[PDB]
Amino acid sequence: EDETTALVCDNGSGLVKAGFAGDDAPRAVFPSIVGRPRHQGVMVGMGQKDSYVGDEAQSKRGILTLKYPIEHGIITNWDDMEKIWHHTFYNELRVAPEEHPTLLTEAPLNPKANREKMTQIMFETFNVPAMYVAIQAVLSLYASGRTTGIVLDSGDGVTHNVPIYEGYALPHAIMRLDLAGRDLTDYLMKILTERGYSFVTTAEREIVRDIKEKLCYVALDFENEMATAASSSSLEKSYELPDGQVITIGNERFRCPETLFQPSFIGMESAGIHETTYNSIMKCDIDIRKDLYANNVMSGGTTMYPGIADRMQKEITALAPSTMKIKIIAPPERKYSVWIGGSILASLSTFQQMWITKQEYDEAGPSIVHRKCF
């Protein structure tokens, strides 16, 4: 065949998004979890199966202890990551990696060891002709079809912010903020406890993740919505657990995403996500700032909450000069924007010479990641 296709995988924490390069959507999207039978089984003709990977672990949740292998964009456990990639290629996509070049995404300001060990596994585990590791935020920018913007990337791993102008990139102005979907989940199960609902274990920690994926929203003013929580009507929502227990969540619902704009609630000094965007834009040159204000791109899974775009717009407009208009461009489909940006990149004809070849790795070693790529 011509061009050989190519393969693209996004592994921020929480979800593997994977598929062929040259398509508009990934074939396989599943949770990045390795769930181990904690309870010793007593039957004959079970499994045994040392561990379960992917949405198999979601189905068989109650037995398992679940371990996310990626925390804060950092792989904690390498064998668990290899198992997840083994699951992507053989269980879903049914590809031999020898037949495809593979793009990986990776997060900004990330330890060198993750990029270098990630390449070491791609060459010396799944034999592969070529690969690339690319920055998450630039891929979302490509997916949005814009040449310029400040990309606010927040996954389940960590939050990142990369300003770009006309292509280029500003290394000093790149900001990484330790907040995530996962930290909002840990805050959320903590704020459910005051209501009497106690979720203590990894299995129902993913149940509050599912709650937060739909019930939670961001206030267009926090204090105003917290004041109208005195007359509870629309702010309460009934939620059904898989147990058949019913949960009723009021003001507790919208103050969980409020943590992004008030990290004093989590107990971290690190500024809210709108001030981090100001911190990135202020580090940029005076000239370009006009379009960075007007071309803010949201990406990732934890920018999905209803009303985030409006809240960021009101806060950035309030802080900034009202001399210029602050447009925020946050697409629906923004969850998959990194993977789509990886699809478009590996489909680019020129990019087919910028691959890290297997040959170039075999001569010059794993350290060449940083030398060739950003």
Binding site: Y217, L220, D221, N224, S234, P306, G307, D310
Partner: protein, 50 residues
Amino acid sequence: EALKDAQEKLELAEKKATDAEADVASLNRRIQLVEEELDRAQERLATALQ
């Protein structure tokens, strides 16, 4: 929610209209004051030139 936001955006767009119109009126007063002071500067200039 679209209503509380559309209504609050209305109260703020009405407030922005109130402020923009307050600025139209406050500016219309200032424009007229600079026009009147300009006429006076021009009259004083015609007087100074004479």
